[PDB]
């Protein structure tokens, strides 16, 4: 409540590989953590232009910016100033798999995100390597507590050029760097929109709204 301002900014430092292609990305964002609203601008600082769809990286560029009701303990925020980290597995329906690790720290009014992205087995003629994806459908992450950690499961889906979907299952484990009050079985709905970008996506702007809630039908 005192550790996180109503208006925060954050920096993203991501590096990784996709089918063996190394790359680096830097971002500058801001938003209202208690409102669940945020925005960020990314810049491919190395390895660009990327030979793959930007969409697989968009969800890797900020959990603190999630609107949690008062009756539902905010796992991520509580962890600060200590901070926290998250580990993610992404299984695409065509065999591709990604493992992503994050470390979230805080310094005053700014959050710092260090991210390592590892993605491979993306079919050369698939939607990713052919850049045929058109953003993510809004999602709903199932979250529960286990071993002092918060685990989130999400059935994500990328909109395909000309109609259709490219499926991907998300599993993210959030690990606070200090004991916090564990939440109950809940969900976080999100809508991530790429609001701007250049011709080759070496520059991108993203908009995200994340709101937590109890089961709709309890």
Report the alpha-carbon distance of residue 134 to residue 154 in Å, rounded.
Answer: 19
Q: Does 182 bind Cl ion (CB under 5 A)?
A: yes
DSSP-derived secondary structure letter, 78: H
> In the bound complex, what is the minimum distance in angstroms from residue 204's beta carbon to its own copies?
21
Report the alpha-carbon distance of residue 138 to residue 209 in Å, rounded.
Answer: 10
CA distance from start to end of the chain: 29
Rg for the chain (alpha carbons), in Å? 17
Q: Pick between residue 134 and residue 153 the one whose CB is nearest to its own copies.
A: 153
> In the bound complex, what is the minimum distance in angstroms from residue 15's beta carbon to its own copies?
10
Residue linked to tokens 């597995």: 89
Beta partners for residue 31, in sequence order: 8, 38
Q: Pick between residue 26 and residue 169 the one whose CB is nearest to its own copies.
A: 169
Q: Does 145 bind Cl ion (CB under 5 A)?
A: yes
Residues forming the site for its own copies (CB under 8 A) = 17, 19-20, 22, 85, 87-89, 93, 95, 97-99, 101-103, 116, 118-121, 123-124, 137-140, 142, 144, 146-147, 153, 155, 157, 164-165, 169, 171, 173, 185, 187, 189-191, 209-211, 213, 215-218
Q: Pick between residue 145 and residue 211 the one whose CB is nearest to Cl ion.
A: 145
Report the alpha-carbon distance of residue 209 to residue 35 in Å, rounded.
Answer: 8
CB 46 within 8 A of CB 117: no
> In the bound complex, what is the minimum distance in angstroms from residue 188's beta carbon to Cl ion?
12
Q: Pick between residue 92 and residue 201 the one whose CB is nearest to its own copies.
A: 92
């Amino acid at each position: 409540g005192s550790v996180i301002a109503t208006q925060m900014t954050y920096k993203v430092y991501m590096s990784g590989t996709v089918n063996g292609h190394y790359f680096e990305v830097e971002g500058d964002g801001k938003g209202k953590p208690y409102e669940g609203e945020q925005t960020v601008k990314l810049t491919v600082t190395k390895g660009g232009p990327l030979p793959f769809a930007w969409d697989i990286l968009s969800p890797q560029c900020s959990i603190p910016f999630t609107k949690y009701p008062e009756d539902i303990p905010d796992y991520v925020k509580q962890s600060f100033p200590e901070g926290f980290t998250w580990e993610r597995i992404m299984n695409f329906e065509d065999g591709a798999v990604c493992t992503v690790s994050n470390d979230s720290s805080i310094q005053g009014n700014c959050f710092t995100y260090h991210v390592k992205f590892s993605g491979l087995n993306f079919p050369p003629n698939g939607p990713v390597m052919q850049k045929k994806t058109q953003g993510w459908e809004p999602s709903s992450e199932r979250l529960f507590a286990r071993g002092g950690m918060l685990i989130g499961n999400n059935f994500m889906a990328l909109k395909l050029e000309g109609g259709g979907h490219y499926l991907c299952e998300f599993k993210t484990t959030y690990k606070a760097k200090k004991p916090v009050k564990m939440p109950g079985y809940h969900y976080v709905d999100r809508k991530l929109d790429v609001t701007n970008h250049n011709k080759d996506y070496t520059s991108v702007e993203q908009c995200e709204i994340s709101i937590a809630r109890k089961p709709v039908v309890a």
